[PDB]
Amino acid sequence: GPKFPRVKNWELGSITYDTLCAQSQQDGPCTPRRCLGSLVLPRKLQTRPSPGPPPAEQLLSQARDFINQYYSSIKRSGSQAHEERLQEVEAEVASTGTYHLRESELVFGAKQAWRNAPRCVGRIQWGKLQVFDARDCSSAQEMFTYICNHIKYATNRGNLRSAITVFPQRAPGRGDFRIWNSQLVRYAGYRQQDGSVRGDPANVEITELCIQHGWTPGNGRFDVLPLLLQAPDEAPELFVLPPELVLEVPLEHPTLEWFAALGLRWYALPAVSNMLLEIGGLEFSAAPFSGWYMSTEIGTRNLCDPHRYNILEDVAVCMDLDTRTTSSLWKDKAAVEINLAVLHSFQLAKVTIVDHHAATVSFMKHLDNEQKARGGCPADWAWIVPPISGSLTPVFHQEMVNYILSPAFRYQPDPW
Amino acid sequence: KFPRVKNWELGSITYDTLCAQSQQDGPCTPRRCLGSLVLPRKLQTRPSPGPPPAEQLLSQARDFINQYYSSIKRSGSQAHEERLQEVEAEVASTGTYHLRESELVFGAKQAWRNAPRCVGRIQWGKLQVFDARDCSSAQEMFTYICNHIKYATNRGNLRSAITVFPQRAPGRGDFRIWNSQLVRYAGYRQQDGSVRGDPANVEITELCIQHGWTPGNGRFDVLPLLLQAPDEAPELFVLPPELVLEVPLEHPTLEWFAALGLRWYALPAVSNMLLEIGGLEFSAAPFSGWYMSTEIGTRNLCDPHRYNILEDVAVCMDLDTRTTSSLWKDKAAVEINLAVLHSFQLAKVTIVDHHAATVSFMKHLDNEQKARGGCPADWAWIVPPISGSLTPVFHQEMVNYILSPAFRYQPDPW
Ligand code: HEM
Ligand code: HEM
Ligand SMILES: [Zn+2]
Q: Considering only CA atoms, which of A264, A241, A259 is closest in space to residue A184?
C-alpha cells in the first residue's frame, strides 16, 4: 500500500497513513537496530551552545524552508512577495551572517513550534496563542517587566490564556538572553541536614543558585522562588515576583474534609522558561511560554512522584489504607483522591484546568484535524498517555508516529 | 554507539551494550520512531514454501549453537566443534537442520528472556518445556495441549510452560493453532452489531461455528480449539470443562459486585505466535505463565472494545457519570482491579498485581545489566495500563531491540 507509516487505532479499528513525517529534516535518536523513543533527553535536538557563527549555508537552507512554510501558510507560495522575501533573507545573511523575522513570521513560527511539539497533549489549542514580541528587550530589568506582564495577561485572574514572550535571538560572539529557572513559578527545594528535602526536590539546584546570588531563603514547603534573569554577557540578576501576581490554589477534597488540613497547594500557571524556540535556523534562547494545567501533572506527577513531593503514603495513611502490601492497591486509591482534590480545588477557585479524560478526547480530535490538514501529527506516545488510568483514555489505543518538525521547541544546556 | 540509559527516579545511569548483538531490524529510522505500533508492517514471517538461503540459515544456526555452548560453559570444547559440524552437514545436504532437546529447552527460555514486551521476565529461568516435535496429527496436538493445560494450571498453583510442535518445513504447510489463546471466551455478533461475550474473539468464534461448533449464548462461553496439521483443514476440539479453571469475580467489600456475574480464566496461554530458534521456526508453540491483575481488571474488562464494564460498575457504585472530572472511570477501574486480586487470592489461583510485578522487573533489569550488559524492553508495554507513574518502570528509560531466539507474530492461517 502507501509507502508511509500505517497507523492504527485499536479501539475503533481505523487506519491512517502519516505522510507528514516525509517533511522532517532533523534526525531523531532511533535506528533500525534499536528504538530509543523512551529516552527523555536523547543527544539529538539538544541545542548545545554553538558560540561561533553557524554555517551560513546551513542557516540559509533552514531560513528558506521556513520562509517557504510561511508563504505557504498565507497561500502566496511562488508569488513576487515570496521570492522577494527569500532574496531579502539571503542578502541579510550574506552581509551580516544572520537575519531577522518580520512580526507576522514570528507569530506564525511560535504557533507552529507548539503545533509541532510531539510531547504536548494540549495541541488542539495551538491556533490560540498570544505572542508577545519582546525582541526590543535590552536588560535583565526589562526582561522582568515583560515576564510580569506575561504572567498577568496569561493568568487573567483564573481564566488562563496561552501565551509566549519572545526575547532577542542569539547572535555570534555575544551572550544569550536566558531565564535560569525552568519555569516562571517553582517551589524552593531546601536540602536538609539529614540529606532529605523540604519543598520540591526537583528544584534543589536552582534554589541553591538563587541563594548563591543573594536570595534569602525561607523554610517552607511551598516557597515561590525568585527569578534569575540574564541579559547578554552579564551575570544573572535576581528578581522577586510580587505575591499578588502568583496565583495559587489551596488544595481541598470534595468529601474528605481532612485533606485541606494537609496544607497542600499548587500554582495556577504552568510556564516553561528554559527551552529554546527555533525558527528558520534562528535561535530564541529566552522565550517563556505558558498554557494551563492538565490535572494529572499536579495530582499525579508533582505530588506523587517518589522524587517529587511523594505524598502517596501520607494520604493513604489518612485514608486508613493497608500500606503494608501492594495488593491492597493503596497507591492507586490515594492517587485517585489526590487527583480529584486538584480538580475540585481548581474548579472551586475558578482557575482553568483540564482533566486527563477531557484532554485526551480533545487530543484525539486534534489528531483528526491534523490528519486532514497536514497528513499526520508527530506524537510521543509515552508523554501523551496520562500517568494514571492510561488505557481508560482514548490515546492509549492510538498508535503514534514520532518525528521532529521545525519550527520547534528544544531543550538547551543550562547557562551555568 | 551505546545508548546511555537513565532512571529519573534514582538518577542512576547505565549503558546498553547488548543492543550491539541485534541482527534483526525494528520499524524505526532516524527520520521517525514507530515504537508505539503493535504489529510490524514488514517484520512479519513470510511463507516457507521454499528453503531459506543456506548461508543465512547457517549463520543463524552457528550463532545459536555458539550461544548454547557458552551457556553450559563448554565453548570451544570438542562437543561444541562437533555440533557445529553436524549442523553444517545437515544444512548443506538438506537445506535445514534439527535441534537437540537440550538446545530447544535453552532456546525457549532465551526467547522469553529476549521478549521486550514482557514484564514478568524475572521468571525466565523457570519454564517447563514440553517437546512435542513427534506430533503428526491435530488429534495428537489436542492431547499435548490438554496435558500442557493440566500441568500449567496445577490446581491453581500455576507453573510456566511451553509446548513445542513440529518446526516449519519448505513447501509443506505449518502445524498451527488457530486460536490466539488456549482459553478464549466467545464473542457473538447480534442483531444490531452489538456483541455478547468478548468482542476481541468475534472472528475466531465464527470460524469455530463454521467448522461445526454448536454455539452457546452466554458472556463467558469457553471456545473450542481449532487445531491444524500440515495442509489439512483445521479440526475442532472441545476442551474438557474440568481442565479450564475459572475464577468467579467478587469484591472484598462491595456486596453487589458478585451480582454482575463476571469471571475470568486462570490460565493465560498465547498460542498464535512463532518461536524462532537458530533460524528454525516453530509455528505452533503455545506458552503460558500467570496473569498480572491489570490484564484482566483493566484491559480485558474495561477496554472500550472489550467487555467495557466501566459504566455498569460506576452506576452500581452510584458515581457521578455526568462528567469526566468526577473521575468515575478511575474510581471504578481501581475497584474492578481490586476485585480481580481479591477473587484470585480467594480461589487460591496465582496472580500478581502491577506494583509487585514492576518491582520484580526492575530487579530483572539490574540482573540483566550485570549478566548481558542490557535488556531489551518496550516501555509502552512494560508500564501498566493504570497508575503508570505510581510504578518504578515508568521512570526508567528503556532500549528496545530484537534479539534471537525470539517470539514473533505470524500471519493468521485463514
Ligand atoms: C493550553 C494548555 C496546555 C495543556 C493542557 C498542555 C499540556 C501538556 C502536558 C500534559 C505536557 C507534558 C508535561 C510533562 O509530562 O512534563 C505538555 C508538554 C509540552 N507542551 Fe503543552 N500544553 C498546553 C499548552 C502549551 C503551550 C501554550 C505550549 C507552547 C506554546 C506548549 C508546549 C509544550 C511542549 C514543548 C511540551 C514538552 C516540554 C518538555 O519536553 O518538557 N504546551 N503540554
Ligand atoms: C510468569 C508470569 C508472566 C507474567 C506475569 C507475564 C506478563 C506479561 C504481560 C503483562 C504482558 C503484556 C500483555 C498485553 O498487554 O497484551 C506479557 C507479554 C508477553 N510475555 Fe509475559 N508474562 C509471564 C510469562 C510469560 C511466559 C511463560 C512467556 C514465554 C515463555 C512470556 C512471553 C511474553 C511475550 C512474547 C509477550 C508479548 C506478547 C505479545 O506481543 O502480544 N510471558 N507478559
Ligand atoms: Zn523508536
A: A241
What method did the depositors use to determine the structure?
X-ray
**A198 in active site:** no
Who among A11, A39, A402 is closest to B397 (CB)? A39
* Residue (of A107, A259, A37, A287) closest to B401 by Cα position: A37
3-state secondary structure of B396: strand
Neighbours of B174 (CB within 10 A): 23
> Cβ(B122) to ligand 2 under 6 A?
no
Q: Which domains does chain A have, with CATH numbers?
A: 18-135+162-172+276-290+360-384 (3.90.340.10), 136-161+176-247+411-415 (3.90.440.10), 248-270+293-358 (3.90.1230.10)
Distance CA B238, CA A36 (A): 45
Which residues have their alpha-adjacent CB atom under 5 A from ion ligand 3? A 30, 35, 37; B 28, 33, 35
- Whether the CB-CB separation of A49 and A64 falls below 8 Å is answered with no
Dig out the grid coordinates for A202 from the structure.
526537583
Measured between beta carbons, the chain B residues lying within 8 angstroms of A406 are none
The structure was resolved to a resolution in Å of 1.9
- Identity of the amino acid at A359: A
Which residues of A fall within a CB distance of 8 Å from B378? Answer: 35
- The identity of residue B94, as a single letter, is T
Residues B32 and A35: beta-carbon distance below 8 Å: no
User: Is A347 in Cβ contact with B390 (below 8 Å)?
Assistant: no
Decide if B302 touches A, using CB distance below 8 A. Answer: yes
Which residue among B28, B345, B383 sits closest to A35, beta carbon to beta carbon?
B28
Burial class of A334 by CB neighbour count within 10 A (0 to 12, 13 to 18, 19+): buried
A363 to chain B, any CB pair closer than 8 A? The answer is no
Instruction: Respond yes or no: is residue B235 known to be catalytic.
Output: no
Name residue, grid cell 514473533: B408
Query: Are B34 and A5 inside 8 Å of each other by CB?
Result: yes
